[PDB]
Design a protein around this nucleic acid. Structure first.
Lengths: 256, 40, 236, 273, 236, 40, 236, 40
RNA sequence: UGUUUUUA
């Protein structure tokens, strides 16, 4: 009896992800994503379960990890609003509910050094940099597949981007209480985090509210071998699962 | 003995003796045993 | 009517007493319960979760670098880091363990200390993690350190070592607030052999340090933390 | 319950001390794995670390000054402090806020204790036997506009009358629209460019208006009201990173510019004790 | 005598507490009960009764005309009426549903919306009743409206259509008071085909609009209404 | 436990679980079924 | 609510009443109990232990000599010591028996009086220990003393005599504080024969005197002692 | 009847009827009987 | 059997 736990395959719909250097997948709070049951349901409308047309891996535009990269943050389901049929359903329905399989990818040689913290934060309410009672504007909290680069400059009505304070006034070291995985280049090239639907309500508006936030944060900085390109690509691939939509309706218009 | 009609009127429930730290400590898909190689 | 005698302490407001009271909303139905993942019954559940220690507690401002313990290549018989084990103070104050611990006056049980190596895969190192029980100073050399509780750590495929700090105390409970009598001792790390880096790699590699509670951990006598403060009541 | 098991020398290919934290798992490594241990017992239940005990004791949440004085020739009784209104929130006093904000969702029945204490800073012959009315004003109900308005009638509104110096004590069930209150809300009221972030009515406990029902005396008596909240039948979900930096606003995760470092810089190097 | 300790909140008058009290008329016999028709146990009984909506909410003074939704002949692809679904406000405020709803802070469940045609028997019309769930604006055209929950209504022998507004909400309860987060959405009516009037008939015909609660309707957290006011206590 | 002789002294009765909205909603002589033509 | 009537003495603080009270530390776990030797349940256990009487109560300052009853060689028919038996006063005041006795107002039962000889082994002596019941003066000679309760003590291999003062009282309880009516009487010791010292030994030899309670001893009505005092509350 | 959750809230235990003065009065290795020569 | 518990 031999085989491996580092070699993994995830097939969702027509999409397949393979990894040969995987660290054991994280299932947030030991709870797999599931469809809403009738005993928790409030909305009487029969939910559209879109199956394999949306429950598939959407790869997000790659990020560049440099020696001076502070990190990146994505909001879900926001990040997938422009992704195929999922995005359309998201905008055509009043209510939406979805779990996610997040798959973060960062490959390097055995000469490379560095560690990413891949963490999923439910209700990642961002802090404004202006302090006081200043609000973070819709456009900045809903960036899409672009996400928020924490290495960037502040913007008027935008969030605070000091990765040390998790953009919320909590310390970085404590993010490990949230379902997380490291991409330690010596050990691992892929993180995977299966997220269930986490909310105080059984189903919610997908446009106005982001249930979870994916953060990829360099802890140990990238140290490339001598003469190497001082950069590594980080590719985020997200698949909705157990997705439910309710209250189909004219397409919602959002800011921008 | 409860002196009121409402459940909100009652005293605190004391302790939930049911703990399970696993949901926070070991939220992994595949089972990881202490002693076994974490990855193989 | 029933003859009664009112005891002293009648009409007192005690912030800790769990008494019944009249509901201001009678016959009100509260919203149904639904399943939400990540239910917390006890703090002792979540305190068992590893959180990063800002062990590199040497910066002008709070930095990510503060979590990075520097390792240097070709150093023999030399110290990596050192800390006392006042878990409600110092490097531990800001950790989840420290934060929860500071909501309590007494603590007991074993701590779980983890180091994760983040250097190249083609690098090699042996480190010795040493716990020094109280009564003796923090070890000034390796030979001194290794006389106490220690784990010799070979860095390889498994990136992480987990050294448990065994509950070494005469008194059954220690103070969370720095106290001399209830000092937990010292924790240190040393080069057992050295850090050897592969060709074409330079400079410092880093350890990540984690602290968590073992399931034999105890906390009691709740108290207000000194980790948060205010002068003025907040507004919206 | 066993705390530590008896464990002797180990010469094994099972290395409980070696793991991969890259997995995001905290392996339940015990002293028995690193050292030779003796048998000990817990003698401990963990009763005080239960969320009902942790979150379930009274705390000051609001303090307000109101004056019982002549209302003749006053146009706004709310702003002359003949009555004051409090938008109920547990996010105004930071010590309790941090405790609640260890979690994302909390569902609890409340137990309020209101303590009114009087003071006559100017010349007064006696301590007036004032009765305070604490009126619960849920959203939509007419907020009082005058100290003896028709609103205070409270034909349907919950209301408490109690003597100053003495106290009131009433339970309130979980009044949240959702299955739990949101300590954090990564969202908006609607898809609008200028709408409020974080702030949502999901946490609108309601409002509390305070007046002294007594008519005026010749002397001004200042009544400082202190609202105390105790959570009961507490359920908590999704543990979070503890608050590190100070707060700036209610219902916002905002922290001050130029705030001080919270990580306690060492005296000496990383090697120091 | 039994030793007692008086809790805080002793001697408080709480307007909601349902306690026993001494009767001021002992041994008094109250008048016998006789059968009276129309006994009301619960408000949820009577709130299920249809009441007219003043949808034509466009008059200088309150008028009977305010209850009459005008229909115009030979209008294609055009709006008949439009309203938001804040049932404790606007056109709904004055209805029995609205009035009862305003005595409460939270509402849940499905609304029952009825239209009754009052035009000639020899007239013909097809209307589309459209409910727009929240998150989208009020529909500006028919093609937009029909994408939501809608009933195409053929006007004939049966004079009345009954469109149920299905409970379409994420949060289990909505606020009765106009709130953005707990907006119920929009209701609109459009010409599906047109109004065709018989020869020798002219001008406007009218719809009567009704609102009632479905048996799955919920109300909680009683409150004072803002539908009535006084400055002075009344005299006889 | 009632501490008084009088019925008026007792607390409120709570809830009449017996509803029948029919007496207000359907006060019709002939039975009308949902789905059947209201008039024929 | 239950009709009550508050008795007089309501809201009084009585330092003796053993009532239930609300705990200020709810759900707090107190440290486990371990075995400690020398558990004391009752004072009547420890009061049965012999403690030295400062019978030689004749010094300018408190001295070790105060515990030493002098014996002189070649003395016939002569007194060794004499004391009244107010056990809450005089020579007994400072003893454990006296100290515990002074925490109480009434005492009853038999006292145990011991003498231990500390002279040379080659010395010889016979002493007569005499208890004089109340009503008669302290004996002025031996012939008077021996008429009461007495033990003739031959000093030999057994160094110690144990004379029990039998409870000789009409009233069932005596006052611990010196009172005439509840006087316990007198205790005296005399030379029965003489002290004979061996050759090459000179001067005084000494007795050690002990007092303890017999198991039939009784104490009741607790009171404050006058054996300790303060003007100012202490500081650290 | 205890009106509180806590053991500390309860009243005093009254009396421990179990005495044993021997542990203080006769803390000797070998047994010494009244009447027998203390030493032999 | 370089075996780990439990009981006299």
């Amino acid at each position: 009896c031999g085989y491996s736990d580092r070699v993994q395959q995830i097939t969702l719909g027509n999409s397949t992800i393979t990894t040969q250097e995987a660290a054991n997948a994280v299932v947030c709070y030991a709870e797999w994503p599931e469809y809403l049951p009738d005993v928790d349901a409030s909305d009487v409308n029969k939910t559209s379960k879109p199956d394999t047309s949306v429950c598939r891996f959407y790869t997000l535009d790659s990020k560049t990890w440099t020696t001076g990269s502070k990190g990146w943050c994505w909001k879900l389901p926001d990040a997938l609003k422009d992704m195929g049929v999922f995005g359309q359903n998201m905008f055509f329905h009043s209510l939406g509910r979805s779990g996610y399989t997040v798959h973060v990818q960062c490959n390097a040689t055995k000469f490379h050094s560095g560690c990413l913290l891949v963490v999923v934060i439910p209700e990642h309410q961002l802090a404004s940099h202006e302090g006081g009672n200043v609000s973070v504007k819709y456009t900045f909290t809903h960036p899409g597949e672009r996400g928020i680069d924490l290495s960037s400059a502040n913007e008027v009505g935008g969030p605070v981007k000091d990765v040390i304070y998790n953009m919320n006034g909590t310390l970085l070291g404590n993010l490990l209480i949230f379902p997380h995985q490291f991409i330690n280049l010596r050990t691992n090239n892929t993180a995977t985090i299966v997220i269930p639907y986490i909310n105080s309500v059984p189903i919610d508006s997908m446009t106005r509210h982001n249930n979870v936030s994916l953060m990829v944060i360099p802890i140990a900085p990238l140290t490339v071998p001598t003469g190497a390109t001082p950069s590594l690509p980080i590719t985020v691939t997200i698949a909705p699962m157990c997705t439910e939509f309710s209250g189909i309706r004219s397409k919602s218009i959002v800011p921008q | 003995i409860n002196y009121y009609k409402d459940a909100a009127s009652t005293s605190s429930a004391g302790q939930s003796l049911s703990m399970d730290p696993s949901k926070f400590t070991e939220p992994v898909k595949d089972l990881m045993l202490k002693g076994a190689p974490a990855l193989n | 009517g029933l003859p009664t005698t009112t005891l002293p302490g009648s009409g007192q407001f005690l912030t800790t007493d769990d008494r019944q009271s009249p509901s201001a909303l009678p016959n009100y139905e509260p919203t149904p319960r639904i399943h939400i993942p990540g239910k917390v019954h006890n703090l002792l559940e979540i305190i068992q979760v590893d959180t990063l220690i800002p062990m590199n507690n040497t910066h002008t401002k709070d930095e990510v670098n503060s979590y990075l313990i520097p390792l240097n290549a070709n150093r023999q018989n030399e110290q990596v880091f050192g800390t006392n084990l006042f878990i409600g103070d110092g490097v531990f104050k800001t950790t989840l363990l420290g934060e929860i611990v500071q909501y309590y006056t007494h603590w007991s049980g074993s701590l779980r200390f983890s180091l994760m190596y983040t250097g190249p895969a083609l690098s090699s190192a042996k480190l010795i993690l040493a716990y020094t029980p109280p009564g003796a100073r923090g070890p000034q050399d390796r030979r001194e350190a290794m006389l106490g509780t220690h784990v010799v750590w070979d860095i390889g495929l498994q990136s992480t070592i987990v050294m448990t700090i065994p509950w070494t105390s005469g008194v059954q409970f220690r103070y969370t607030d720095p106290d001399t009598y209830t000092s937990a001792g010292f924790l240190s790390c040393w080069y057992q052999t050295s850090l050897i880096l592969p060709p074409e790699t330079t400079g410092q590699v880093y350890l990540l340090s984690f602290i968590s509670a073992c399931p034999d951990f105890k906390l009691r006598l709740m108290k207000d933390t000194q980790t948060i403060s205010q002068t003025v009541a907040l507004t919206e | 319950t066993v705390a530590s098991i008896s464990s002797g020398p180990k010469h094994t290919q099972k290395v409980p001390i070696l793991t991969a934290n890259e997995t995001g798992a905290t392996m339940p490594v015990l002293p028995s794995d690193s050292i030779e241990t003796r048998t000990t017992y817990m003698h401990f239940n963990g009763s005080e670390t239960d969320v009902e005990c942790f979150l379930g004791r009274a705390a000051c949440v609001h303090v307000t000054e109101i004056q019982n004085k002549d209302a003749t020739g006053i146009d706004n009784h709310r702003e002359a402090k003949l009555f004051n209104d409090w938008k109920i929130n547990l996010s105004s006093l930071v010590q309790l806020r941090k405790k609640l904000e260890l979690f994302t969702y909390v569902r609890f029945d409340s137990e309020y204790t209101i303590l009114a204490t009087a003071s006559q800073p100017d010349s007064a012959n006696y301590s007036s036997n004032l009765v305070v009315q604490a009126m619960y004003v849920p959203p939509g109900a007419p907020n009082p506009k005058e100290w003896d308005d028709y609103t205070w009638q409270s034909a349907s509104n919950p209301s408490v009358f109690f003597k100053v110096g003495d106290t009131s004590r009433f339970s309130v069930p979980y009044v949240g629209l959702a299955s739990a209150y949101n300590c954090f809300y990564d969202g908006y009221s609607h898809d609008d460019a200028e709408t409020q972030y974080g702030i949502t009515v999901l946490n609108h406990m309601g409002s509390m208006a305070f007046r002294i029902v007594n008519e005026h005396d010749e002397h001004k008596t200042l009544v400082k009201i202190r609202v105390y909240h105790r959570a009961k039948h507490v359920e908590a979900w999704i543990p979070r990173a503890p608050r590190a930096l100070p707060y700036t606003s209610i219902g916002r995760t905002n922290y001050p510019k130029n705030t001080e470092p919270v990580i306690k810089k060492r005296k000496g190097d990383i090697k120091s004790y």
